[PDB]
Symmetry: D2
Amino acid sequence: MNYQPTPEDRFTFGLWTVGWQGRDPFGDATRRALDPVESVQRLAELGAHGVTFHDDDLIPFGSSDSEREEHVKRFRQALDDTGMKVPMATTNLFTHPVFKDGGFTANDRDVRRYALRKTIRNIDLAVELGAETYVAWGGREGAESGGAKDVRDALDRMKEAFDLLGEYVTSQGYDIRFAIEPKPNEPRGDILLPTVGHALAFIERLERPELYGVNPEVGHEQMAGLNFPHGIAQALWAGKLFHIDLNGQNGIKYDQDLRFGAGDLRAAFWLVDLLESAGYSGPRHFDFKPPRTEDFDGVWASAAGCMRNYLILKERAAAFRADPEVQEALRASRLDELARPTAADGLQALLDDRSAFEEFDVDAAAARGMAFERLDQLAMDHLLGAR
Amino acid sequence: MNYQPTPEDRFTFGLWTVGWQGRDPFGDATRRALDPVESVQRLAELGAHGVTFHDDDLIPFGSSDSEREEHVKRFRQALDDTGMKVPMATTNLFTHPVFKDGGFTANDRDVRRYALRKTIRNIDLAVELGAETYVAWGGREGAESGGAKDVRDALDRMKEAFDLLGEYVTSQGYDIRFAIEPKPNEPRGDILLPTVGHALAFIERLERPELYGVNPEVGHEQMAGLNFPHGIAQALWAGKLFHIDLNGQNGIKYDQDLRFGAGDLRAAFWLVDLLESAGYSGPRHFDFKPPRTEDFDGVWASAAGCMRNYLILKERAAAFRADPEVQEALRASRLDELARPTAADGLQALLDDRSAFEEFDVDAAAARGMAFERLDQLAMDHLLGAR
Amino acid sequence: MNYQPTPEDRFTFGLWTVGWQGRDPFGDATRRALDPVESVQRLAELGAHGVTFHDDDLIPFGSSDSEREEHVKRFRQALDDTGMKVPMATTNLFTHPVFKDGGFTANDRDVRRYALRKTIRNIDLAVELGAETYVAWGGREGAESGGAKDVRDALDRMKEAFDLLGEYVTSQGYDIRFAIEPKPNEPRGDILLPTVGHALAFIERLERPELYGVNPEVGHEQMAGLNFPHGIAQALWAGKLFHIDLNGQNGIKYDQDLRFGAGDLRAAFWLVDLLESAGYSGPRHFDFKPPRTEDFDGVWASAAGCMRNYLILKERAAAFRADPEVQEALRASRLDELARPTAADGLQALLDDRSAFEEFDVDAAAARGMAFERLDQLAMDHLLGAR
Amino acid sequence: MNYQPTPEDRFTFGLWTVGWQGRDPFGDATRRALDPVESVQRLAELGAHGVTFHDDDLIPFGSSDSEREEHVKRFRQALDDTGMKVPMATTNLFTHPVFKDGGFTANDRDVRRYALRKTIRNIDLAVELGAETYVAWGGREGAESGGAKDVRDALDRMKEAFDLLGEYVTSQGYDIRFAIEPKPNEPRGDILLPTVGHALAFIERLERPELYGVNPEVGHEQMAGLNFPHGIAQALWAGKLFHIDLNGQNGIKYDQDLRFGAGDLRAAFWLVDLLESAGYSGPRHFDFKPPRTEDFDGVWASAAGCMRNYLILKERAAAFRADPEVQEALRASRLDELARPTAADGLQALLDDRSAFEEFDVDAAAARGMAFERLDQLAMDHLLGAR
Ligand SMILES: *C[C@H]1[C@H](O)[C@@H](CO)O[C@]1(O)CO
Ligand SMILES: *C[C@H]1[C@H](O)[C@@H](CO)O[C@]1(O)CO
Ligand SMILES: *C[C@H]1[C@H](O)[C@@H](CO)O[C@]1(O)CO
Ligand SMILES: *C[C@H]1[C@H](O)[C@@H](CO)O[C@]1(O)CO
Ligand SMILES: [Mn+2]
Ligand SMILES: [Mn+2]
Ligand SMILES: [Mn+2]
Ligand SMILES: [Mn+2]
Ligand SMILES: [Mn+2]
Ligand SMILES: [Mn+2]
Ligand SMILES: [Mn+2]
Ligand SMILES: [Mn+2]
């Protein structure tokens, strides 16, 4: 009873994940930097399908065109040697001190133009390597104090930046879509578009909404105490789940980025149940950081645990939905009735229906138990294999 | 140096606020029920402009048409005697046991039809009394466990309900708009459309989006650790701030509903600064609960404190924006540059601009300080009157 | 592969748990009151070992001595008929309006004396029924505002009350110990002795500290985002884990009191691992509330799930500690070295030891990986039965 | 109406505060390192009374005895030139990779011995410079996973380390006391002794408890959603408030370390009211980080704001306690009765007192309002100078 990933499971990792040196707000790096080529080769051996990157993880900031070409050729050769793909790319608009007040919403206009130029250079590179999704995480867009940022002007600048990138893509004829990833705080006191709902609502005001979706991250909605599977069902309902970042988080605290399955394990089960039952077919990407307590062996063990946890959860959710006893419980709790229209008969019919009001027996309907606890224990038994 | 409210300040209160008997999850009522007529008269004496109500606060659940008419006539006479208005009305779809699994998203279809009928009866009453906004708080829509609610089917049922109410309003020719009020949890484990962003995104999928906005509540976004003034700027940016619920909350915990100004006092200052500078002209509604430790004198003192706090905050934010030294600091922090387009020159111009990339001096731009702390201390001095 | 509780597992429940009518801050009761006799009989059939009670769950507030005796005789007969025990009793000092500002720390002295008298009457009853532990939850001790309670005077009054109860017990020669249960908020804005550490520190200032321990509750430390198993290890380290309240909670929000195993499932696993490995031999008490969505069948199903979850977790933690591969991993992560004294050789020896400083090779020690992720995945595999 | 600090206000700052280069989990330093000599001179000009330091802020890790002596002589000359004192010193047991699993509770015994040796070397230096308090923050003591740390063995190692340091101090005849500073998480997933209560309870198990107190930090208890002024009243009640760390934090999130007065402004008011009314006479130390958005001018402006905010709050709390109208309100809310013994008459007298039970009129006592809202609005008016 083994759970081995294969490239067909679509498991992906950022170069910055297994590549995290372990520098935190209070401590120095505990591990030496890894060459991207080595990470590609080690991930291919564990069964991953591909890798993702921020421009600066691949090309050291400030590289001359000559060095650039060389970093790209070497990476390209490792992808050719392993059959690894690059489904998503993104921009680092947060490390360099120039981005201290943001990229697209920095108060200085010069910095905003530079941010857009640095992003466009990376879209051309992503297209060349075959990425289908381009993620945007505005980690420096926000503030630590109320007067420092007028939010309405900041959203106009954010809209302007995204509309210009959609103009660029369409003008070049590229087949690439954008995914905004929300985060409520850290490193800024408060970050703009803090949750999946704030990002979905913002998208609706862009000039070409169809080019943009969301890249929700497990730990980020949990940093606001929200239910991750409910936010994902809302992104699926809107047709905007373009990509997803998988990891673990223990509650409302700093962003831990623990391996997938760590953190809220029951939320992990319900998320896998939803992705698999809705038919999500994008990459299963891990945005995690192997703890700084680990050496290189612990890095690979942590990345391997990410994929394993997904596969065990997949099996338990499939056994849960497939159990006749669970199907019976779902009917007992009226999940079948939630799926039926409340009033397909129309407004006039509902208004004339005496059984909906005048003769509705409220006490009899109130007395019906929902049987949710029996259903939840069945889900618990299946997650634990005590079924 | 007094701060006296007048009906022109547009201060409103729910009947259920000063009318809260003090029953909590762990204790019995500490105060006798108040007749709505008495609350109207006491609020008019404190300087309020109007009151709001849930159907059941005005007409005891189960009232016969005869008793209904009588409760309405008496209320109407107290409004005529005091000049109080009723700008907003809403439905109680949470107290009666029948709503234990929700109103519009209850799993039982019969309950969903009943919820819609109970709501429509109250819209006719609200229109008759002159309300311009009809609020919807789905406090029972959500779940305590993952299998109990399929969220995509729940959003289809929620969409269906709102579309049917927009069909009803348009069919009757009423001038009334809807405002959804988000709340992340309590009484359900997790509530659907948990934050202002989730409610704004949902609105965009209704058949007539222009009929719906949001009614954000101070304490509810704070229950998710979010910045209330930033969520309000986002609702203003979208043109959807139809109404607002003012109160106080001390962090991530149960919903306290403390008087406005209690809780996060600096967030209260920045919210008043934003409402007044954006020109919000709807009601300033208080959705609060005088603590159960109080008698009737403490109830009126708490409601009076709500209005006073708003007025003191209004004065301090106006003195802050009006100070030449602050205007100078805003320019020093580049708030003026955040308001200018990043690239009014267009994409091609930005692409050809060498000053935006090829010749941009990153180290010089990085070295510029933002001067936000000096600006924040000025705001602090003005809030405390130490200016 | 079944997990059937027997009275030998020491599973206990409060009358107020399966007896919860479902009244919440926003809604009416969804279930009829249960007679304590019926609850005793139903719990005995599920395999529970005993029940616990607050004075008011057994004797309706205000009962005459005549009615009192009658409620006691009937209860006593149901305990005799089923073989159920009563290991713990406690006082309701939170429901009646008189306790609106507290019991032992109410500002009115008359209320504080009444609280003590009501408590002493219940200690005599608990002793008569055989309880060995008397719990104290000061749910109304605290405040919603800063000026309402001087905390140093409130701790003097709290100390005074506990010292008087220890004087009473010793004077009567009773074999009963006290357990304080902490809670950080709800129903008060902030509650005194908010966490297990605040309660342990307070105990050390009582006149007879040996008579008092703690009754930590899973969901209460989680309402402050703390690690429940770490707080329990600290109460065990101090020799003060007198009793424990088991339940589930999904993060920092209102107190959910979900069935044990719901909420943070990995914290439940590590707590069971600790109770069983430390040899805790007190009752495994469930302080939970079957959701108001349920009827009586759902109440019994929820209580049965509490015991089942404990038993499955017990098996998985025992299989985890018993696996040779895990024992090897524990040695690889140096758990054996954490158990050895850092300097049994003494201060002078450590000061003269050049290998501890002058010749310590920091880079070599820094480079050693801790291998915690491999260990954590082993724990994950065992919890999920994928081992 | 100015508020100028003088050395007599006892304001202190860590070298690491104004010296923070701005490196965060997601970005590079935005400011050049400051020489400690420059910080001493700039702080003396703003009116500070002294500075504090971690060993590594003063002596670069790895310095030879020769360089050590030189860093000390230069610092000593700047203290002599400005009249600045050094009231507290502490150890960096968190930055170097060797401390990745802790200092005193690292699983490797060699690292624990090294941690103790590095600490003892710094106590001798602190004594030489005149510090009276030696702080201990175990930021790396804790874990990200359940199996990595047995907490009971970790507390035995923590006790062992503190007992050895108390043996060292007593053996050398030094007049120095220890203060443990709690923090609930960050950088570890969960940190041991997470709150002021966990640290106070732990102290009671050391061999010489009188040598140890607490150094609570505003933002750290707020990271657990707790009330900082209530935790401080508890440390004062126990006689253990040896030192204090002042700053601001906006809720449950990463540790912001904002300037004092930022964050929860009403908690800042109640804390100043308590320190001043209890007569705390230790240093008013700021443990803050000027935001990375700032240049050197913004660093000094932020440190100056820390002291200003304290002084404005001091004035408003003194005006609040001094107002006859407030004294009257305090009596109306029975604060005077909370300060009187509940039963100075003794247990027997209380037991025989019929007015405490048999004839106590519960309904009359329940009906008395506490008048807390009127009192809280008075406090609000005084904080805002609207009084
Ligand atoms: C480095 C980033 C990217 O912006 C995003 C890619 O999904 O994930 C992060 O790690 C930020 O969360
Ligand atoms: C009773 C409700 C209404 O639905 C809303 C009116 O603004 O406010 C509440 O009190 C729910 O928050
Ligand atoms: C009713 C109470 C008791 O004080 C305690 C018994 O363990 O548990 C509660 O339910 C309060 O948490
Ligand atoms: C650098 C530390 C010290 O341990 C403590 C001194 O009060 O404060 C910090 O900044 C850790 O919070
Ligand atoms: Mn993250
Ligand atoms: Mn991510
Ligand atoms: Mn509310
Ligand atoms: Mn509201
Ligand atoms: Mn509880
Ligand atoms: Mn309990
Ligand atoms: Mn801090
Ligand atoms: Mn500190």
